[PDB]
Design a protein around this ligand. Structure first.
Ligand SMILES: CC[C@@H](Cc1c(I)cc(I)c(O)c1I)C(=O)O
Ligand SMILES: CC[C@@H](Cc1c(I)cc(I)c(O)c1I)C(=O)O
Ligand SMILES: CC[C@@H](Cc1c(I)cc(I)c(O)c1I)C(=O)O
Ligand SMILES: CC[C@@H](Cc1c(I)cc(I)c(O)c1I)C(=O)O
Length: 569
């Protein structure tokens, strides 16, 4: 009885939550009520399996159980059986579900609902989250749930609940969206590029983090993590949550053989412990570490070792190069690994290989500097314009690259691409590349998945498909789509109403940004100057209507003066 196994290990709480998360991510459209029913129903059945391990169906598997459950409230997916049926659910996971933006009422009401029904209040949380992020790292979502409870606990007992809650909640929202995106990458990596890609990625990341840990150690960790994330990404949340616990235990047990900064983490409760490790800063770099050239360039036994065990040898190279380069991004370390392999392929087949792969590090030079210079450039640019103007530049640039992409997607992705400026440019050159280029891997992966649903640009498709590691370079190389035929103007697209006078300031900028995109799509050839020339005028167009009492008309009357000058430029 698998159900019993998981129940005993995780307890009633986590089990309940994890099961809720699972259902919400599968049937994101079904309402909260229908889900809680199914959860309790499954939980009650789970209990009759812990002691009575031979009760009917306790022998069955988690998919069969969960599947038969969901199919009682859904249609073609339920027409299938094992494997088939399950996978059918996974393929129908929506990354951009048409769901009503989650608004949160006055501080007073939420506290009443929380103090009144606390268990339901938190369940409602997981459900609304899990359904808008079908690939959320489940075990981590539990950690956030706790902090969510801890926020209301304190703040609902304060003089000014508002000034206490709102911040803690804004900070949770962000940290949550960031976590969701990091995970979504892990899943895309596994599903779209396979176990090898993810493993290589994990080895580089872990090598950097745990430069003192031996290769055999890192490799053992990578293998476990793969299992965990394979399970989480496929919906095996119970098995994931369990295995993740096992791993975190193993890591705190072998602290000495891994990292000297796990001390803090291993003293905390499970949830806090797991979250602590995944965020632990890199360990110190071992003192006297030999030059990489000795074993991977100068040695005359290279092509032999490469032939003997390619994947192990290259793995060793990556582990060895990453551990001594925390200043390099993970994707860069991989580019170097691909470049190294490719060279061995060529050279090991030649007459004198040793002098074929003699000047290999000279091939790295260009790959190392490209990121460095682009970083340096875009930071100084960012420093002179600020986050807002900087986002605009990216809006215009990326809209020129791939005009076919939907405006909502462009605005989101660009805005996110711009946040890299504030996140990373503050750091010293030493920690810049990891922060920057890896964060862009996540943002670009967002663009890819959202595109994958409804493809409209082969340039997005290409850059998204042919290499995970080269995604960013591939995109930077793009300039202007020359085959793109500009779209004509649509009245409804350039109609500024008074409703924009109640939106926040951010909500207003996002409307001024959504417009800029539509403009570029109409005149891609237009110049950065001519655009700013009208962009400035767009600000004036609205700094009037909302300031003309008792005239809803303004939106149209002034809108005429707007479009008029618009068609001009
Ligand atoms: C800004 C919307 C977020 C959802 C979200 C999250 I994640 C965590 C908390 I706390 C929230 O209040 C909210 I709203 C998203 O759609 O990514
Ligand atoms: C290397 C994988 C993760 C970090 C990580 C680690 I190290 C340990 C546990 I347990 C986790 O759940 C996670 I996520 C990353 O670097 O993105
Ligand atoms: C480095 C120059 C910018 C160009 C640019 C563009 I295109 C549109 C607007 I509006 C701008 O303010 C700017 I500066 C870029 O290519 O990233
Ligand atoms: C040319 C810059 C790259 C992306 C990039 C990089 I690399 C570093 C920083 I700092 C950024 O803000 C950004 I945007 C691109 O847009 O193609």
């Amino acid at each position: 009885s698998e159900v019993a196994h998981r129940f005993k290990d995780l307890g009633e709480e986590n089990f309940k939550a994890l099961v809720l998360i699972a259902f919400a991510q599968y049937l994101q459209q079904c309402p909260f009520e229908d889900h809680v029913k199914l959860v309790n129903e499954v939980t009650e059945f789970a209990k009759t399996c812990v002691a009575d391990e031979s009760a009917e169906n306790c022998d069955k598997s988690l998919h069969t159980l969960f599947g038969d459950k969901l199919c009682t409230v859904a249609a073609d997916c339920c027409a299938k059986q094992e494997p088939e049926r399950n996978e059918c659910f996974l393929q129908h996971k929506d990354d951009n579900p048409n769901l009503p933006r989650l608004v949160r009422p006055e501080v007073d009401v939420m506290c009443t609902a929380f103090h009144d029904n606390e268990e339901t209040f938190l369940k409602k949380y997981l459900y609304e989250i899990a359904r808008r992020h079908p690939y959320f790292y489940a075990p981590e979502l539990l950690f956030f749930a706790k902090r969510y409870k801890a926020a209301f606990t304190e703040c609902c007992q304060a003089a000014d609940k508002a000034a206490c809650l709102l911040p803690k909640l804004d900070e949770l929202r962000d940290e949550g969206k960031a976590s969701s995106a990091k995970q979504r990458l892990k899943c895309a990596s596994l599903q779209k590029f396979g176990e090898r890609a993810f493993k290589a990625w994990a080895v580089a990341r872990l090598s950097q983090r745990f430069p003192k840990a031996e290769f055999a150690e890192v490799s053992k960790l990578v293998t476990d993590l793969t299992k965990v994330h394979t399970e989480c990404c496929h919906g095996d949340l119970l098995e994931c949550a369990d295995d993740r616990a096992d791993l975190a235990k193993y890591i705190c047990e072998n602290q000495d053989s891994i990292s000297s900064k796990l001390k803090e983490c291993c003293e905390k409760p499970l949830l806090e412990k797991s979250h602590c490790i995944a965020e632990v800063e890199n360990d110190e770099m071992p003192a006297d570490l030999p030059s990489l050239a000795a074993d991977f360039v100068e040695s005359k036994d290279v092509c032999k070792n490469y032939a003997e065990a390619k994947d192990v040898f290259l793995g060793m190279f990556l582990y060895e190069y990453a551990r001594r380069h925390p200043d390099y991004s993970v994707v860069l370390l991989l580019r170097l690994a691909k470049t190294y392999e490719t060279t061995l392929e060529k050279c090991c087949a030649a007459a004198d290989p040793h002098e074929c792969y003699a000047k290999v590090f000279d091939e790295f030079k260009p790959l190392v500097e490209e990121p460095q210079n682009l970083i340096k450039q875009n930071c100084e640019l960012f420093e002179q314009l600020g986050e807002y103007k900087f986002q605009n530049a990216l809006l215009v640039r990326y809209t020129k690259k791939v005009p076919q992409v939907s405006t909502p997607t462009l605005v989101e992705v660009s805005r996110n691409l711009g946040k890299v400026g504030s996140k990373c440019c503050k750091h010293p050159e030493a920690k810049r590349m990891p922060c920057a280029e890896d964060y862009l891997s996540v943002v670009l992966n967002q663009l890819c998945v959202l595109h994958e649903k409804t493809p409209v640009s082969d340039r997005v498709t290409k850059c998204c498909t042919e290499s995970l590691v080269n995604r960013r370079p591939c995109f930077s190389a793009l300039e202007v789509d020359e085959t793109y035929v500009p779209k004509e103007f649509n009245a409804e697209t350039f109609t500024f109403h008074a409703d924009i006078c109640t939106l926040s300031e951010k909500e207003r900028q996002i409307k001024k940004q959504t417009a800029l995109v539509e403009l570029v799509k109409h005149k891609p050839k237009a110049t950065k100057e001519q655009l700013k020339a009208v962009m400035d005028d767009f600000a004036a167009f609205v700094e009037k209507c909302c300031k003309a009492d008792d005239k809803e008309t303004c939106f149209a009357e002034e809108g005429k003066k707007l479009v008029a000058a618009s068609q001009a430029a």
